[PDB]
Design a protein around this ligand. Sequence first.
Ligand SMILES: NC(=O)c1ccc[n+]([C@@H]2O[C@H](COP(=O)([O-])OP(=O)(O)OC[C@H]3O[C@@H](n4cnc5c(N)ncnc54)[C@H](OP(=O)(O)O)[C@@H]3O)[C@@H](O)[C@H]2O)c1
Ligand SMILES: [Ca+2]
Ligand SMILES: [Ca+2]
Lengths: 282, 280
Amino acid sequence: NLPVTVAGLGPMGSALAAALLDRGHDVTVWNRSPGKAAPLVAKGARQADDIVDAVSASRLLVVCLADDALYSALGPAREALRGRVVVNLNSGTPKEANEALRWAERHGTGYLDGAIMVPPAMVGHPGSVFLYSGSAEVFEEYKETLAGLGDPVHLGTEAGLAVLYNTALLSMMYSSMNGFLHAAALVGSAGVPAAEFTKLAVDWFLPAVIGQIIKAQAPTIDYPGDAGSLEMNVTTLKHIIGTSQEQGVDTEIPVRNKELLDRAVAAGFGESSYYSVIELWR
Amino acid sequence: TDQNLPVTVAGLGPMGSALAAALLDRGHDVTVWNRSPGKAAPLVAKGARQADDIVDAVSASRLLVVCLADLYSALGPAREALRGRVVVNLNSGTPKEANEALRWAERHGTGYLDGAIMVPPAMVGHPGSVFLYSGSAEVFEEYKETLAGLGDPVHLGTEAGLAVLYNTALLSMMYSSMNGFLHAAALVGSAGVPAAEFTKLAVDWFLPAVIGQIIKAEAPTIDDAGSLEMNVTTLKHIIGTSQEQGVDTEIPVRNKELLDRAVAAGFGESSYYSVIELWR
Ligand SMILES: NC(=O)c1ccc[n+]([C@@H]2O[C@H](COP(=O)([O-])OP(=O)(O)OC[C@H]3O[C@@H](n4cnc5c(N)ncnc54)[C@H](OP(=O)(O)O)[C@@H]3O)[C@@H](O)[C@H]2O)c1
Ligand SMILES: [Ca+2]
Ligand SMILES: [Ca+2]
């Protein structure tokens, strides 16, 4: 029971449909190219002839398209959307989430915007987390079904929040990964084995030092417990740059990180907190 | 093995003081020394003996814990008193400097460990404190129990430069991660999202469950982030969202530029981890 329709059968859409099939939903799939449905049909999905069919098969509609492609893909369903719910899992920016909400509401359709926080292969498995924003009543109604994809975290009722959080978190992820790669290059230049360093960095340093220092620096969280003044950190960075030069490793990462600090000291004090770096960007 | 081992601490800045106080708390006979007078008094209050000069300080203990700002200049006058003692140097800047200190120590007949303090002064001698060490394994095993009073002691290997190398590495990751976090916080903050709650989500969940897992997934020798090209698209959305929110795009622009360089060097369609080959 609990019928669900998935629109969009790229790598992620297919993972979504397959996970719902694995939990035993009646899953109807739809895709622009008809080739991509066959493996899901093999797994017990019904392929919809057309979008009206797809949409009418289920009260819940899970959308995972390539971007725009929402309006063009589901538009022809017209009045069949009325009284249904769209869970849009692809949005690029908050403005696009907001446009999709307007579109949905214009058709009498409930709307949730979601951000998938794991790769396709993790969808449906323990550890999977999806962020949602939109109507709380819609969320509470479909919570149990959404839980088959990933632990569902409701951020608030405004449409654009999930994509905002997602873009924010991903921005941190890229910077952290790049810093990690500089670190691994640095120890690798002396022939340190990467696996063991990586475990030290990730199982210990990341949560015990990086996480605690972020919470220490955050002015509204109260580890005793600080990154120290900007000046002290500029000196630390100079040693990291020195170390990179003597090891033959590119100094771009730590040079940039240092330059940023120099701008903050200039705007503020050698004594100002690390967190005040943020005021350069807002 | 002497539970009350005499120890000398040279350098009484915020960190050196924390070191000395932690050893005093664990019942060592601690002699302290600093260049500038005036920093020793609180430690003397706690039971430390103040050394007049560095020969005095050095000749009081077989174990010498050094925590200077910079070593050669401070301990130079004690050249001959150094013979048969052990230096634990907790403040080298680079691996080369650690190696120079080793050569200098060994020349004078003194054992040498280099250490990196991984917590702030207020955490020294408290739960969670960790110190990284490198140098002679016999020196390490001899003083391990004493060093444990400062922080959980992790021996990385016998080569002098390793502790500073690991420390600089780890700290390089920390700065990048913090800067990314600050961009994230600015971004949610621009919509009026409260910072505390976002910070706890980012740190208590995202950091270990996502950032740490993906690093381990990308690391070729541990058993992902998708191709480089997929990630450039994701970064373009982050830039777009940053522009719509009125938040400076520097951080995600620089991250994106790095990926563009990687795809240009022929690492497009390769794994994210291959970005590393741009730097070595
Ligand atoms: N505090 C932290 O957050 C932290 C965390 C981890 C690691 N560490 C490391 O621990 C080291 C020691 O730090 P600290 O907190 O004690 O402050 P610091 O400013 O790095 O060092 C101050 C100490 O170094 C001495 N010093 C400076 N120049 C000297 C010279 N030419 N000859 C002899 N002594 C000299 C100072 O003596 P005077 O007082 O006479 O000038 C003072 O005792 C740091 O450099 C840092 O790399 C610090
Ligand atoms: Ca705080
Ligand atoms: Ca791996």
